[PDB]
Amino acid sequence: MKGIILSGGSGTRLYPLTKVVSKQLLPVYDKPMVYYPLSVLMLAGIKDILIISTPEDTPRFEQLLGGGSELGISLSYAVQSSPDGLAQAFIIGEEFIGDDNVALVLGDNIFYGHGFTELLQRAANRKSGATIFGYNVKDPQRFGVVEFDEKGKVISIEEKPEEPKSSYAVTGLYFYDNRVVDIAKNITPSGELEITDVNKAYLELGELHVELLGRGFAWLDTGTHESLLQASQFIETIEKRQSLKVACLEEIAYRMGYISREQLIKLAEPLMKNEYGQYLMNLAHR
Ligand SMILES: CC(=O)N[C@H]1[C@@H](OP(=O)(O)OP(=O)(O)OC[C@H]2O[C@@H](n3ccc(=O)[nH]c3=O)[C@H](O)[C@@H]2O)O[C@H](CO)[C@@H](O)[C@@H]1O
Numbered sequence: 001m002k003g004i005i006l007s008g009g010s011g012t013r014l015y016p017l018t019k020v021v022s023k024q025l026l027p028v029y030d031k032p033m034v035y036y037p038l039s040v041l042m043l044a045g046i047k048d049i050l051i052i053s054t055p056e057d058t059p060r061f062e063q064l065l066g067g068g069s070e071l072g073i074s075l076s077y078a079v080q081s082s083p084d085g086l087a088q089a090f091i092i093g094e095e096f097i098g099d100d101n102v103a104l105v106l107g108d109n110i111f112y113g114h115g116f117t118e119l120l121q122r123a124a125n126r127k128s129g130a131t132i133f134g135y136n137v138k139d140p141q142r143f144g145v146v147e148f149d150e151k152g153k154v155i156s157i158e159e160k161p162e163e164p165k166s167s168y169a170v171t172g173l174y175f176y177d178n179r180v181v182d183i184a185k186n187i188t189p190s191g192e193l194e195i196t197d198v199n200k201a202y203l204e205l206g207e208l209h210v211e212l213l214g215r216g217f218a219w220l221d222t223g224t225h226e227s228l229l230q231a232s233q234f235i236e237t238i239e240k241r242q243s244l245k246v247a248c249l250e251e252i253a254y255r256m257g258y259i260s261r262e263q264l265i266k267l268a269e270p271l272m273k274n275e276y277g278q279y280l281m282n283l284a285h286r
Pocket residue numbers: 006007008009010080082083084085086088106107108109142143144145159169170171172194195196
C-alpha cells in the first residue's frame with residue numbers, strides 16, 4: 001500500500017503565521033506539523049509516500065524531508081496547482097499509485113491514542129474496500145459526518161450536513177483499494193472534487209468500513225491560532241508527563257526496523273547540542 005499526504009491549501013485562517021510560512025511547516029510543539037500525518041503513514045507500515053502541496057510550498061517540504069532514505073522510506077513530491085478538492089490527490093497521484101492500494105492523510109491532521117497503530121496496521125492490511133475513521137466531536141456540522149447504528153455498519157455520510165445524523169466527524173485519514181483511482185476520475189464537482197463522494201462510492205458498494213475512535217483517542221483541530229496552540233500543549237503535555245514522543249519520525253523508523261542502531265546514532269548526533277537528539281541517543285543505546 002502507498003500513502004499520500006495532501007498538504008497544500010491556503011494559509012488564510014492562520015494569517016499572519018502563514019503569510020511567509022506554509023501551514024504544515026508550523027510548529028506543533030517541537031516538530032513541523034507535517035511530521036504528524038507522515039508518522040501515521042509510517043505507523044501503518046506504508047513506506048512509499050507522495051507529498052502533495054502547492055507550487056510555492058512543495059520545494060520547502062522536499063527541503064525538510066528529502067527522499068526519505070534516512071527514515072528508511074521513499075518520499076516523492078507533486079504539485080497541486082489549485083485546491084480543487086481532496087479527491088484530486090488520486091488524479092494527481094494516479095501514476096504514483098499505479099495498481100496499488102493507497103491511504104490518504106491530510107497534512108494538518110493530528111491523531112493520537114494508545115491502540116492507534118494496531119488500528120492503522122489493520123486498515124493497511126485490508127486489501128479490499130475503504131476504511132475511514134470517525135471521531136466524536138462537539139460540532140459535527142463542520143465536517144464529514146458518518147451514521148452507523150449497528151453493529152457499527154455505515155448507513156450514510158454527509159459533508160457538513162445542515163443538521164447532523166451523528167456526533168461522528170469523518171477525520172482526514174482514508175484507506176482505499178486500488179478502485180479509488182477510477183472512482184475519483186468518475187465523480188463530478190459538488191466546485192471541488194470531494195472526498196465525501198469518493199466515500200459515498202464505496203458506501204454504495206457496501207464496502208465502506210468505519211473505525212470509531214472513542215475513549216481514549218485524540219484528534220486535534222489545527223485550524224485556528226487557538227487550536228494550533230491547544231494541539232501544541234497536548235503534545236508537550238503527553239510527551240513530558242508520559243515520557244514518550246509523538247510523531248518522532250526517527251524513533252518510528254528505528255522501532256519498525258527500517259534503520260539500524262548506527263543509522264539512528266548518525267541522525268541524533270547533529271541534533272545533540274539540542275534536546276531532540278538526546279531522546280534519540282537514549283533510545284539508540286538500549
Ligand atoms: C474536503 C472537505 O470538503 N471536507 C473534509 C475536510 O474538511 P475541512 O472543512 O477541514 O476543509 P479543509 O479545506 O480545511 O480540509 C482541507 C485541508 O486540506 C487542504 N486541502 C484542501 C483542498 C485541496 O484541494 N487541497 C488541500 O491541500 C486544506 O489546505 C486543508 O488543510 O477535512 C475534514 C477532516 O479534517 C473532513 O471531515 C471533511 O469531510
